[PDB]
Design an enzyme around this catalytic site. Structure first.
Site, short mmCIF file in Angstrom:
data_model
loop_
_atom_site.label_atom_id
_atom_site.label_comp_id
_atom_site.label_asym_id
_atom_site.label_seq_id
_atom_site.Cartn_x
_atom_site.Cartn_y
_atom_site.Cartn_z
N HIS A 131 6.25 -6.70 59.48
CA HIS A 131 5.09 -7.37 59.45
C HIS A 131 4.51 -7.70 60.47
O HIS A 131 4.81 -7.58 61.74
CB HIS A 131 5.57 -8.24 58.75
N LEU A 132 2.70 -8.31 60.80
CA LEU A 132 2.57 -8.66 62.00
C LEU A 132 2.02 -10.22 62.16
O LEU A 132 1.41 -10.80 60.50
CB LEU A 132 1.57 -7.94 61.55
N1 LIG Z 1 9.59 -18.90 53.69
C1 LIG Z 1 9.04 -18.48 54.79
N2 LIG Z 1 7.48 -18.61 55.36
C2 LIG Z 1 6.62 -18.53 56.19
N3 LIG Z 1 6.89 -18.16 57.02
C3 LIG Z 1 8.58 -17.77 56.74
C4 LIG Z 1 9.26 -17.85 56.25
N4 LIG Z 1 11.29 -17.40 56.61
C5 LIG Z 1 10.31 -16.96 57.98
N5 LIG Z 1 8.61 -17.41 57.77
C6 LIG Z 1 7.99 -17.08 59.28
O1 LIG Z 1 8.13 -14.82 60.00
C7 LIG Z 1 8.71 -14.80 60.90
C8 LIG Z 1 10.01 -14.06 61.45
O2 LIG Z 1 10.53 -14.19 62.42
P1 LIG Z 1 9.85 -12.42 63.56
O3 LIG Z 1 10.53 -11.37 62.28
O4 LIG Z 1 10.29 -12.59 64.72
O5 LIG Z 1 8.26 -12.66 62.76
C9 LIG Z 1 8.75 -16.14 61.97
O6 LIG Z 1 7.65 -16.72 62.96
C10 LIG Z 1 9.24 -17.59 60.96
O7 LIG Z 1 8.57 -18.64 61.05
#
Ligand SMILES: Nc1ncnc2c1ncn2[C@@H]1O[C@H](COP(=O)(O)O)[C@@H](O)[C@H]1O
Ligand SMILES: Nc1ncnc2c1ncn2[C@@H]1O[C@H](COP(=O)(O)O)[C@@H](O)[C@H]1O
Lengths: 111, 111
Positions: free
Chosen positions: A97-98
């Site tokens: 994801h971005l």
């Molecule tokens: N249930 C959720 N809804 C929205 N954002 C989320 C949720 N669970 C995780 N995230 C976000 O997704 C990202 C996962 O980390 P990364 O893989 O480093 O992008 C972090 O910025 C979290 O805040």
């Protein structure tokens, strides 16, 4: 599956701000800027280090969609796109994801 | 043209670490991590906010090339990809490009 696999399947909650045949976007649950949203592909790729040549268009699509959403959200002063890969990259959710962050001056280094 | 337009034209110096028919990569002159390089498309697009739908594959290509270079450079522990857009994004060179940073734990927020 991952957290994002569940959001796609409508198993974990998320207000969806954009969706097409290949991806969707929603706000980050822990925003690091006044506007902070994610663009995720419906196809599952655990991490960009394992993405295939054939996924280039899908990856570029996430950026074009991030650009469009940023405009829709009023980020006329710019923003920053980010892809976190592996442990050093700070990756938490293993579904490519971005990130798109704006609404404030982003600093340097980028972490 | 821009600094990157000149590097492409072999007018401004840069040790090139990868090149194909559509892009090239080189190390950042002010590295923010032990490994910090850029991937730039030969085609000129001043900023991602003005990229067209039809540029998706080229944009995805920069990521696939960044992934390959990261592997070539030994970033087996991960890395972070970044695209700086406009003033808030911290953009300095108005020729679309991608950053890839690794070799150390990247922090959060990403600037
Ligand atoms: N249930 C959720 N809804 C929205 N954002 C989320 C949720 N669970 C995780 N995230 C976000 O997704 C990202 C996962 O980390 P990364 O893989 O480093 O992008 C972090 O910025 C979290 O805040
Ligand atoms: N001559 C150069 N060779 C390599 N990197 C450079 C050179 N001039 C600028 N840069 C880098 O290119 C980036 C331009 O900023 P940005 O547009 O925010 O990516 C900064 O990280 C600069 O260190």
């Amino acid at each position: 599956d991952t957290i994002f696999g569940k959001i796609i399947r409508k198993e974990i909650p998320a207000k969806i701000i954009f969706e097409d045949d290949r991806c969707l976007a929603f706000h980050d649950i822990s925003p690091q800027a006044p506007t902070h949203f994610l663009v995720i592909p419906k196809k599952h790729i655990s991490q960009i280090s394992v993405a295939e040549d054939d996924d280039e268009s899908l990856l570029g699509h996430l950026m074009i969609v991030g650009k469009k959403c940023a405009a829709d959200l009023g980020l006329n002063k710019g923003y920053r796109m980010v892809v976190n890969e592996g442990s050093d990259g700070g990756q938490s959710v293993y579904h490519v994801h971005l990130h798109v962050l704006g609404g404030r001056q982003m600093h340097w280094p980028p972490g």
